[PDB]
Amino acid sequence: GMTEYKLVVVGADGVGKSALTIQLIQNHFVDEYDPTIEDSYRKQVVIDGETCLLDILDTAGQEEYSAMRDQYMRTGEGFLCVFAINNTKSFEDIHHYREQIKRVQDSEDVPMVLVGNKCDLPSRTVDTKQAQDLARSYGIPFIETSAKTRQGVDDAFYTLVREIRKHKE
Ligand SMILES: Nc1nc2c(ncn2[C@@H]2O[C@H](COP(=O)(O)OP(=O)(O)O)[C@@H](O)[C@H]2O)c(=O)[nH]1
Ligand SMILES: [Mg+2]
């Protein structure tokens, strides 16, 4: 059976969680995707010559009960922690998402990547140094992305898979 990597995209409303997932899946930028919709996506990819499947939950932070949400948070192998480089509050919110992950996983060693999205925008209020400093503090990679231009999108998901492989070895 083809190895599957169960991945979970988390972060504040409006950082580009849906746009990043749809760019990876459909290879286009969606300007408009209902902020309250949480759905999973499955995509076959080749990472360093290994054919594998990514099983991705795009989270929406809604209150309504979802058996699927609970399952992915509990059994997810890797987390993308997304903020927007032009949204200081979304960067300030990252510590909350990391705490939620450690608690549901009951582990201090969960594979994670810090994702700074919307790097196409000039109005940057979160600099590369402060993002690299937070990622260093957590012992995780930092990747700059644009869902709009596709800059760093494969790099973000593929780096998370490389972190999961390391954790499995
Ligand atoms: N300029 C730019 N806009 C983005 C990017 N990613 C998402 N957006 C826009 O930011 C808004 C929120 O995106 P969305 O994917 O709904 O965020 P979510 O709430 O995290 O799922 C939408 O208007 C998107 O079109 C990006 O990389 N660059
Ligand atoms: Mg969304």
Q: How many CA atoms lie within 13 A of 6 on its CB side?
A: 10
- Helix (H/G/I), strand (E/B), else coil: 135: helix
In short, whether 19's Cβ falls inside 6 Å of ligand 1 is yes
DSSP characters over 96-133: HHHHHHHHHHT-S---EEEEEE-TT-S---S-HHHHHH
Note the CATH number of domain 4-168. Answer: 3.40.50.300
The domain ranges of the chain are: 4-168
- Helix (H/G/I), strand (E/B), else coil: 64: coil
- Ligand 1 atom with least separation from CA of 13: 19
In short, whether 41's Cβ falls inside 6 Å of ligand 1 is no
> What is the b/e burial string over 92-129, where b = at least 16 CB atoms within 10 angstroms of the residue's CB?
ebbeebbeebeebbeeeebbbbbbbbbbeeeeeebeee
Q: Is 85 exposed, middle or buried (0-12, 13-18, 19+ CB in 10 A)?
A: buried
- Separation of CA 169 and ligand 2 centre (Å): 33
In short, whether 147's Cβ falls inside 6 Å of ligand 1 is yes
In short, whether 21's Cβ falls inside 6 Å of ligand 1 is no
Q: What's the reported resolution, in angstroms, to a tenth?
A: 1.8
